[PDB]
Amino acid sequence: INVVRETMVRPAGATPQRVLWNSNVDLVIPRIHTASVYFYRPDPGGVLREALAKALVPFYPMAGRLKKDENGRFEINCNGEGVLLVEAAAANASVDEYARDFAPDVSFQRLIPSVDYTQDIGSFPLLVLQITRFKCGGASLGVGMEHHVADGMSGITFINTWAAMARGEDPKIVPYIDRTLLRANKPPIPKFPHVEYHPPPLLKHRIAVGLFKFTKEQLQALKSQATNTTYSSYEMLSGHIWRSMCLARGLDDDQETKLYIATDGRARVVPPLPKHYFGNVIFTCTPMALAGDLVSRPLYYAASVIHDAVSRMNDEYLRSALDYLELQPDLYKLVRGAHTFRSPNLGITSWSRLPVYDADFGWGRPVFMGPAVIAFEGLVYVLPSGTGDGSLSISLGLQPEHMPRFEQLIGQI
């Protein structure tokens, strides 16, 4: 990959010099990962830059820097120091030479800046953006965001705002920037045990990435296997992936397994949070069951443990977690990235609700929106459909000798 330019873009002007306090859910997050790649194709530089500065007027926390206070608690120091925007060019080109089946791999890590977090926090950009053009109109947007500034939803809002501005339009949107709403009460009064942050079950006493497609003529069936109640397609798919991995890993029947589902609390908090709330609201929801009960009983049981676990996270339960996390012994060791989604556990983060394919700059809309590289096993990305099909794709990492099976049980609905 060749590089034409590298610019540290700061807001167009007039930005507050805040220091944003961060809510407990603004601190417990898996690392600074959350990378993303956007793939474009032809349709029917001097503008992408100024649109970023214009979009950094309302979203000034993105142009800030990471900082600790006197207690070591992480903050967002609104420096206005800027966001890194790179415009790359590839000689070899052929976007699908490059992306091929769009499955994540190390070559996607090259559509993204290198950046050393190990350095001092106050002097790396919280967000980096790369624009890599190809041979006949292929474009690639790489996004690398720090978790302590905003969640995925608030990050996609920015990319959409940036794209809406580059189109020659205007944002309409003012972000709500105040994390004191999710402040735990004084004193913390937990009402639940909160097994979400309990240690995961242990397996009873590098890798291969896999991208899998679910047509619409597959999701129909899952809705056909639904019974007292009747569950939804995503709840079936999720349990289907839970069921498949429990069989792909050859788990013993009496083993406890844990599914780490990220949950958006913006809508279930009373009173409801403001629109365009800028921050991290992602709460953890962990349904659990024995490995045998998932795979021996019908698929609607796997949704039963998933649905009843998500339906328990009401305003009384979410605010009880904020009080709960205030009492934890170490602030960021509940952060568990590299070996929590080990066997027999797993994690499923879904993007089937974020307006992902709304990043039209003028080159059309994305054909692809997905993660750059799979770090390790256990994390399932529920991709959204771009062609309006009603489809649903998933990307996944597993041990090299569990993927050949996992591919065989996923295809059988």
Numbering used by the authors: 3 to 46, 55 to 215, 240 to 261, 266 to 451
Paper text:
One interesting example is the hydroxycinnamoyl-CoA:shikimate hydroxycinnamoyltransferase (HCT), which belongs to the BAHD acyltransferase family involved in the biosynthesis of a diversity of ester- and amide-containing natural products. HCT produces p-coumaroylshikimate by transferring the p-coumaroyl group from the acyl donor p-coumaroyl-CoA to the acyl acceptor shikimate. It is an essential enzyme in the phenylpropanoid metabolism, conserved across all land plants. Interestingly, unlike many other essential metabolic enzymes, HCT exhibits relatively low affinity toward its native substrate shikimate and can utilize a variety of non-native substrates.
We crystallized the HCT ortholog from the lycophyte Selaginella moellendorffii and solved its apo structure at 2.9-Å resolution. The SmHCT crystal had a space group of P212121, and contained two molecules in the asymmetric unit. Several surface loops of the protein (residues 47-54, 216-237, and 259-262) have low electron density support and are omitted from the model. Similar to other HCT orthologs, the structure of SmHCT consists of two pseudo-symmetric domains: one comprised of residues 1-179 and 392-411, the other of 241-391 and 412-451, and a long intervening loop consisting of residues 180-240. The SmHCT active site is located at the interface between its two domains with a cavity volume of 1372.2±10.4 Å3. Apart from His157, two other key residues involved in substrate binding and catalysis, Thr385 and Trp387, are also structurally conserved in SmHCT compared to other available HCT structures. A lack of electron density for its side chain suggests that this residue is extremely flexible in SmHCT, occupying many different conformations in the apo state. This is in clear contrast to other crystallized HCT orthologs, which have defined density for the arginine handle.
